[PDB]
Structure formats: structure tokens, C-alpha cells
Amino acid sequence: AQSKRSLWDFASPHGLHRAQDYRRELDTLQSLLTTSQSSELQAAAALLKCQQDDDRLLQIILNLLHKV
Amino acid sequence: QSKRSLWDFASPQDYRRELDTLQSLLTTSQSSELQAAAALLKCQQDDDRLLQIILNLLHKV
Amino acid sequence: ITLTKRQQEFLLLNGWLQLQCGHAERACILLDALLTLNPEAGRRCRLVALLNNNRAEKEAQWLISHDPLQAGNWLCLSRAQQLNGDLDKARHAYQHYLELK
Amino acid sequence: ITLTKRQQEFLLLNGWLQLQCGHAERACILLDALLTLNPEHLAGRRCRLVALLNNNQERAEKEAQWLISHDPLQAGNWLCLSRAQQLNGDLDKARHAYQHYLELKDHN
Amino acid sequence: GRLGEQEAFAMTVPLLIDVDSSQQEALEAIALNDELVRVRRALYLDLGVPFPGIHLRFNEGMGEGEYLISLQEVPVARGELKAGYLLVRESVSQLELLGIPYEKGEHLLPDQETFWVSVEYEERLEKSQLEFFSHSQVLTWHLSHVLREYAEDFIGIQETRYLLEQMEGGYGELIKEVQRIVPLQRMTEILQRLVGEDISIRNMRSILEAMVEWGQKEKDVVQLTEYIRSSLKRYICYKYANGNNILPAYLFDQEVEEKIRSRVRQTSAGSYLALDPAVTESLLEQVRKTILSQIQSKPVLIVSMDIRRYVRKLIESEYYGLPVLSYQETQQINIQPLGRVCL
Amino acid sequence: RLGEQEAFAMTVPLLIDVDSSQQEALEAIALNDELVRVRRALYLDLGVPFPGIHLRFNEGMGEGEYLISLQEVPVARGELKAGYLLVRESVSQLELLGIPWVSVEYEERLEKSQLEFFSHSQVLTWHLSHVLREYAEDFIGIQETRYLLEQMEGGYGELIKEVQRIVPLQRMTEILQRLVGEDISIRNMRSILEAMVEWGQKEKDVVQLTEYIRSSLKRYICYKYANGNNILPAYLFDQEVEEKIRSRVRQTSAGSYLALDPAVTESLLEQVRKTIGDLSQIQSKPVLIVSMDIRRYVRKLIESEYYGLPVLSYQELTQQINIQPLGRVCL
């Protein structure tokens, strides 16, 4: 109850506009981590590529529909 | 009280999960009573599989 | 073979429903499995199942001579003996149940 | 191979979002990468502790020890330990840690 | 009243709450008659459904702690819990409760984990700030749950007509236009479908404007109600996007959407989605593999509009929580793809 | 007393919830007159009949949290760090590093430097004005259009009676909403109604009719988008791009949306971005000028990125205008 909410509030950080900043940081991080040789950074890079292309698919779907 | 007192004397969604565990437990069995119980459980397990098929076919949206 | 009360309750409820829905054979087999596994509620259910199926007296003797905490143990015996052909002793058992009430 | 503060903030936000969407393991992977690159900030560790608690993993005790040995001024550091100890079976120690957290919250 | 009177007909009460006796005057201390109207009014403000009057009765035929809530003289929520005698309950009991384990016990299933503690432990347990549902709180919680899950039965033709007549002074021409465009039956069915998705009726102006705009173009109830849902873009966005621009998504693959759309079956109204039991089982298995209740942001499924409802009833059986949204339903939203439902 | 049915109440159209710690401290500032003043100014600029504004002081929130909600749904949630003392600056730049939200002690010396000084009322009304301008389409309903028509009955009776018999209320309201969506003022209702009468008998599609009504406001558009002396900056489109866009008009039963191919729109948007060039460094409000039949189709193509840059039709341009082409969008 209260303890679970306190856990989530403790984990919580938060003011960033995101939007364009999200896609720009995604592309920079994916190209930074692609060069890496560590395993943890390899898993992180694959996760970022996954989100980068699921987002590319949703941008394509929004572009494809449009209701003037 | 009549027969109601008799019924009172006899008286006391994880259902499918317990069903599947019990059916696989009793399948290993060898005694006659447990064999009859396992066959009864398989019977009900497949009448339920038929009703799941009926529920899937029956939709209204 | 070993189990816990979790599955035993599933078996108990299924046996009770089958007995209350005139099958009694399915309840008898399920309760036979229950008693063969856990011999320690199910005894009363299988007693009533044998009464409605028609052997019942032998099972009723266990409950009467080892679980004297229930007054219902003298109705089932009566029914069992009325299946066996002892009406006067069944009346005596009914009087015993009335005395224990 | 260092990260920009912008990039560290992106990783923090993504980890928080993954925690906020139940994918505890995905948040753990993101925050583990962030800490392996920049270990300086403990907010990523702070949230990955709760992520590991929700992930059902002794590792939580180690992370709580890090937080207690580097930021012992937050009473929240005593809930995770409690959870870890109640997850690891040491219920009595969890009771003691919870009482300590209550005392520190009363202090705060 | 004699043996010549025909029947003395009487209509069934819409909503009834029958609680046990020995709490007629032992209870009612706190409100018992103001808390109920408060929670009903709050739920209406959250939803907009014109909930009916609440009939409260004390029956001594039952036991000591059994309360039942019945809709139209049919019991819909029973429970043998008047907090025992005074044992208040805990709603989020878990191993967290074993952290400070006061005496506890289980009972009938009202919803989530529930255990009961005595009033002497109440002080030290509230020092731990856990949730404390009293008799009034648990009764009103059950009432609110019943109203939320059965609100479709509170929207009839009479209720919609009352709503329209109450707004005649405000927007007369709008009401006359929506009346001339669509009938009462379609409007009430649309409102019921909207409430079935936890979409609030409260903002009736935009609903009527969307009804006017799209009622001349579409006659199918499903498409019209999907358009009306898409007319509430910002409301849906604020209701689900808890943070600034955070919208959790479980987006569907194009192949899966095409497979779902392949069996719309618009034969005799209804528009039931029957593909094949094996196919729906496989799709549900894929969704389960991709997609737990240990979440806090309430993630939402986002799929193509034309099949949105068809998808919802597909996952309502298991994932009653997870909502389903249409792409048409606003901008400036950061949709976060948690995972593609592959085929 | 559990006998009332529901006590129905309609949702408030516009609500502003501010903290309780400025209920009477922010009173002498005349925020209740500033709000009506800015609303009246916005109406005079646009003509949209904005609703009444309800102002309430809620103590649940703290600090200077203010929220503006349309129909009990928040559309602008701002936090005023300016609550205590910190007056703000809107054109803060690197130049502010040379002479450095600011306190009221710096206000005198900064106004000696003559910068933009938004007080609490000014920032609140700025946010309100932005909300009203970007959400004016939600303030034009059937009831509002009927009120506008009834208000002009004494002035132009026969004109209203004819335009009502020519086009219905729904189409007229949709046309007004589309006009306002491009920041075109409704205020000059006479010419709009005359264009509605003239072109409503010929065209039934909403897009074409509203394009004709836009073209009926040539001089208004010219004055609004050309502050100079008949000089209008333009980013005219090539014939090839216009033909490619027009090739996928897709005029269906409900909506003439131009979904062509995502890659094609991506390439066209890249070409537009390469052409237009800078965004913030550009002044004098350049406008895009394209063929009328696709004007809206072009606008919705660039509304995602270039919300600023307006889109105009060749028909919307009157004569005696020196159109200066800043660059052709090549293919």
C-alpha cells in the first residue's frame, strides 16, 4: 500500500520536453553503443535499435493515415 | 428438516490450472479408483475444451 | 503419492457437486480417491453418496465410532440400515439423534 | 567512451519509463549500462534497486549496501533492504529494518 | 387489496443494498447516508452516467455481517464482511503485511488480497500508514466497483432523454440537430459503448458535436462510436498519459492487424469477430509472451481504429485492465513502444 | 438523500485553477479585468465567440501551479516560479550573460535596458492567449454559429435567410472551424456570408468550398501576411511537386485525405527543409504559396514540423502584389 507507493516514489526522478530530443538522443546513443565491445552495452544497443525501429514504424503509420 | 438435514451433513480463476495439474498427476496413477478418477477428469477436461471452442466461436462484439 | 489440501478441496467440491446432481458414481470414485489418499469432510460426503447410490453402513460405522462430534452420524446410519432392512433400529438411531440434538 | 549529461539523463528517463511500464528487466538492462558507463550518479542505482526488488533477485542487498555506504541520509534506503531481506527469507531482519526506517522517517 | 383487486402492480427497485440487522443503530454513526451520495456523485462526475437512487434496507433474515448489493432485485455483489465485529481490513496485504504481522485471516473474494486486523492493532498499523477501509469505506468501495463495472445498465432511453432535456436551455439547436440526425436508440447505444470503455460521458458537448458531424456519414454503430471516441483525443490522452507525454504502448504488427481484420464478418449487425479458436489462441499466446499486474502506469494497447473494439473484446477475457486505443484517438504524445505483438 | 436521480450539471467550458496563496495577494493586479481585456482583444483579432472564463483558487496544490483546462480537461499546466518575486524574461539569450527569471531588485536596471517584462498577469494572459489561439476550433459549435446568426438578424436579415437555405448549419460551422484553423479571422462576416452564398450552390465538398471562401478574403490575407508595401515573401512550389501531391488526393466519402506513400512524403519534406532553410533566424513571416486545389493538402503535410509557416493559395492572392520568390521547392 503506502510502502509500494513509497518504493515507486523513491525510484522516481522530469522536465525535459522529449519529443525531438528523444529521437535525437536515441540516434546518438545507438551509434555510440554500436562501437562498443562490452556485453551490457551490446544488450543496451540492441534494445535501443529495437525502440528506434518500433518508433520508425509508428512514424510511418501516422504519416500513412492522416485525416485532412 | 427432512432430506435438507442430510444435504447439510454432506455439505462442506485458478480452476483450469488445478484441473490440469490434477489430470497430469492422476495420469501417472495405476490403481483402479485413481484410473476411474483420471478418466472422469479427462472427460471433463475435454468437455471444457469443447466449451472453450464454443465460447471462441460465440462472439457478439 | 502425496498431495496438499489445495487439490483435496478441488476434489471435495467436485464430489459434492456430482453428488448433489444425481450422478453419485462420479462422486463415489472421486471420494474413494480422496479417502485412499487422505483418510483424515470427505467421509460424510461419501457416506451420503453411498446412501443415495446403494456398504454404506460400514463407512457410517467409522464416523459413528470415531467421530462422535456430529449428530448427523445417526441419520445416515438410519438410512443405511433402512437400505439393509432394520426399521426398528433405524427408529432407535433417529431417537438417538433427537437425544443428541 | 564517456556519456554526455544529456545522454545520462536520457538513460535515466528511459529506465524510469521501463520501470513505470513493468518491464523491470528492460529497465535493469538500461540502468546497468548507464552505471557501467557513468557510475557516479546513484539515482540510476536507486531506481534499479526497486527494479531488482520487482524482478525477484541477494543482489538487492548488495545495491542497498552501496546506497547505505554512499548515501545513508535517505530513509528510503531502508525499505529496499527490508524488501530484500523479506524476499530472501530473513523476516526478522526485515522487521528490524522496517522499524529502523520508521524511526528515520520520524526523525525526518 | 381484497380477492377482487387484480395484482397491485409495483415496479422493481433499480438499486438495492440489503445489510444485516444489529447494525441499524450500531452502525450509521459515521455517515452511511452521506458517504453513499458522496461516492455516487463523485463517480458520476468522473463518468457522467446518471446513476439511479440508492435503496438501503436492513434485513434481519441473514446473519450478522453479510451485505448484498443487487441491481434490479438481482444480487450482483454479496459479501459476508461487516469487518467481522470491528476488524478493519487491509487492501494491499502481502509479505509486506508479514513485515509487521498482526493477526490476519482470509474470507470471501471481494477483489484483491484482503486481511482483517483488530482495532487495538489499528493505531500501530496506521503508524505504518497502510490503507484502512472501515465499514463505510468498504461498503462504498463495493458500491463504486458495482457502478463502474455495471454502468451500461444505468443508461436507458429515459436516462438519455433526461440528459437531453436538462441541456435544452444550454444548447438547444445542438440538441435539435443531433435529434434530427440520429435516433435515441443509436445515441444510447453509443453512450453505453463509450462507458463500457471507461470513457466519461460528462463532456456531452463534444459528444453531440461529433454525433452531428459523423451521423450523416456513418450508420454502423461500431464505426460511429469509434469516430466519437476519436473526437475525444485530448481527454483520452490526459486520462491515460499520466506523466508529461508518457503513453505506454503494446503496438500490433501489420500482419496481426490484417489477420484480425480478415474476419470482421459484418453480416447481421453486431459485427462479431470470429476467426478461428486456434488462431485466437495463438494470437493470445503471442500477446501473453510479449506483454503482469505489477505495473503502475496502466499501459494501453494501441491498434488500428477500424478493428479497435474487435481487438478489445479479444483481450477482455484475460487483460480486462489493459485498454485498447485507436491511432486516430491527439498529437504531441510520446508513444513509447514496449514491444510489437508479432505473428 | 439517496433519492435524487443525479443532479446533472454541465461541464464548464474553460477553467483556470491557481493556488490559494495568490487569492488576495494577486488581487490589486486586476487579473479579472486583464483576462476579459485579452479575451476581447483576441475576439477582435479573430472573431471566435470564446466562452466565459471561470477562475477558482484551490488550496490542494502549492507554489505557483496554474492550470488551464478546456471542458474539465487540462490543456496548459504551468508552474510559476515567479510566485515569490522572480519576474521573467521572454527573450533571454547569451546577451543576458553580459548583463545578468530575475528578482524584482533587478527589474529596475533590466527595464532600463528595456527588455520584455511579463508579470504574473502578463504571463498568465500570454498562456491563455496561446491556448485560445491554438484551440479556437473547439470554441466554434453549432450553438455558437446560431448565436452569431441570430445576432446579425437585424443587420443582414435576407443574407442570413439565404445562406441558411443554401448551406446547413453543420457545413457552415465546419467551414468556420477550417477558416479559424488557419488563423483567418471570422470578424468580417459579411464577405464570408457573401462567398458562402455565391459558392455554396456550386461546390458541395467542404475543402473546395472553404478554399473559395478563403480566396474571398484576398485583401485581408494580403494585409495579414505582408506587413510591407505589397511585398510578400514566398516559397512557391514547383509544378512537378504539386502534380505529385495532387496525384493522390483520394477523395473518399468522409475526408479527402492525401495519403500517398510515407517515403514520398518524407522525400518531399526533406526537399522542403532543404529549401526553406533556417527557421528561427527568419523574420518578416514568410508564407508558402501553392496551388489552391492542394493548399490544405500541403498545409497538413507540413503542419507537423512547420506549424509557423502559413500556406496560401494562388486564388487567395489579389493583384498589385510584388511576390518575391525566396526559392522553388525542386524535386
Author numbering:
A (entry chain CB): 51 to 63, 68 to 122
B (entry chain DB): 52 to 63, 74 to 122
C (entry chain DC): 3 to 42, 45 to 58, 62 to 108
D (entry chain CC): 3 to 59, 61 to 111
E (entry chain CA): 359 to 649, 652 to 689, 691 to 704
F (entry chain BA): 360 to 459, 474 to 704
Structure paper excerpt:
The assembly crystallized readily and conditions were identical regardless of which YscX construct (YscXfull-length, YscX32, or YscX50) was used. Two nonamers are stacked upside-down with their membrane-distal sides interacting in an assembly probably lacking biological significance also described by Kuhlen et al.. Instead, 18 binary complexes were placed manually into helical density present outside of the nonameric YscV rings. Each YscX:YscY complex binds to the SD2-SD4 cleft of an individual YscVC protomer. Minor movements are observed at the binding site between YscY and SD4 as well as helix α3 of YscX and SD4 but these do not seem to affect the export gate globally. Our model also establishes that a highly conserved 46RLYP49 motif of YscX binds within the aforementioned SD2-SD4 cleft. The C-terminal α3 helix—which is the extended helix seen in the YscX:YscY structures—is inserted between two YscVC protomers at the cleft formed between two adjacent SD4 (hereafter referred to as SD4–SD4 cleft). Except for a salt bridge formed between D108 of YscX and R701 of YscVC directly at the entry point for the helix, the interaction is largely hydrophobic with most residues involved being highly conserved. Our structure of the ternary complex YscVC:YscX32:YscY exhibits the same open conformation showing that no major domain rearrangements are necessary to accommodate YscXY.
The export gate SctV (YscV in Yersinia) binds substrate:chaperone complexes such as YscX:YscY, which are essential for formation of a functional T3SS. Here, we present structures of the YscX:YscY complex alone and bound to nonameric YscV. YscX binds its chaperone YscY at two distinct sites, resembling the heterotrimeric complex of the T3SS needle subunit with its chaperone and co-chaperone.
